[PDB]
Amino acid sequence: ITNLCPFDEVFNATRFASVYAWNRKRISNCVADYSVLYNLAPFFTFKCYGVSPTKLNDLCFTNVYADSFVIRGDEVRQIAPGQTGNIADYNYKLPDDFTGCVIAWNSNKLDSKVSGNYNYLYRLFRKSNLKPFERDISTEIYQAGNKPCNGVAGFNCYFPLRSYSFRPTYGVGHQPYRVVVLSFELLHAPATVCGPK
Amino acid sequence: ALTQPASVSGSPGQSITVSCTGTSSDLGNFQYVSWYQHHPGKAPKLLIYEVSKRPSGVSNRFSGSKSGNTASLTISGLQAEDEADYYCCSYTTTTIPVAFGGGTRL
Amino acid sequence: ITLKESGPTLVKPTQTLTLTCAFSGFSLNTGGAGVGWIRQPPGKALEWLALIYWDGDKRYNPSLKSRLAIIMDTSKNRVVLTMTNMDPVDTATYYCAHHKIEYIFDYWGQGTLVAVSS
């Protein structure tokens, strides 16, 4: 039992980490009520996969974690327990027994630049797939099957990173749409966070 | 760039309206159009943002709306001080990303 | 919330402009914000020139990027505009503005005008 733990840092940070390298902020030892969320912005989605937001104010969580992404446009639908795709095979992944849920809202006003924003990178291709909840910051030139190459670039030898060009005119379907993904566990351990009562 | 009526005039009090328009191919648009007042010797100021919205500390007589490929602003209550230019701006997609258009004349 | 910029009112056409603009108090802890410069020759219409974000990003306009330069003080004291090969067709007044996405140009300044001294 203490003051409100700083959701204002996770949900109101000046900058968000790129999709290929997402940070975690462990939150513990606080009492938080899920009521200030509705006073943020019109949510594009607020779907919850484990509980309902209305009843979420009367539960105790063993531990919580908050992520920070920059998705592109209408491709947000693939952030779900099971759906696959480019960012769901070579980037952040979700388990088949997910708990917690996803809060997404339009961020065109904050994360956009004239002529596009190049600060966000995503990894298109890998040697293989990746299990849920891992990161891969290693950057090396990738060949194509047979011909060996290193450092140099040319036929079938190219950098494994590509930069977004968001622009302010792409409209719906090609917009940042920031998103934060929580994670809960139901009464498995002594509760670090709870709700007012 | 953009096209706007070079000269607009009307009876004082009521019954006047000004609009902007442009090519749909160049301007993706869908958002982000605004109208600015100008005065001789004084700095411009914002009046409307996001097609039809009003910020704080502005007169209630100023508003507007857009339809199809025609953007417009609604003005009522002509006093002896509303004789100001109205520049309409948006984001384009070719060469210069920002187009200010021809403007108005009051 | 005050904006002000200074520059030489008289300029020899061969001289390169060096303009400084200072702002007194902004929400520096934000994203997608910055300061830009706009000019207006007598008559015709406005045209956008350039703007710089807080993250140091640099976004000159096409067809003029060769003859423009930007110096960032990085201590929030002011911002610097530099242009080369002054062209008498570009005689106009230059305005500072607090660029944003919601507000294209939120606040402006009184403006300073400069003309060639040939």
Author numbering:
A (entry chain E): 332 to 528
B (entry chain L): 3 to 108
C (entry chain H): 2 to 119
Show passages lifted from the paper:
The top 3 most potent NAbs (XGv051, XGv264, and XGv286) against Omicron sublineages were selected for immunogenic and structural analysis, which is instructive for structure-based broad-spectrum vaccine design. To delineate the structural basis for broad neutralization mediated by these NAbs, we determined the structures of a prefusion stabilized Omicron S trimer in complex with the Fab fragments of the three NAbs by cryo-electron microscopy (cryo-EM).
Extensive hydrophobic and hydrophilic interactions facilitate the strong binding activities to Omicron. Epitope clustering analysis revealed that XGv264, XGv286 and other NAbs targeting the right shoulder of RBD constitute Class IV antibodies, indicating another broadly cross-reactive group, but with declined, to varying degrees, binding and neutralizing activities against Omicron due to the presence of new N440K and G446S mutations.
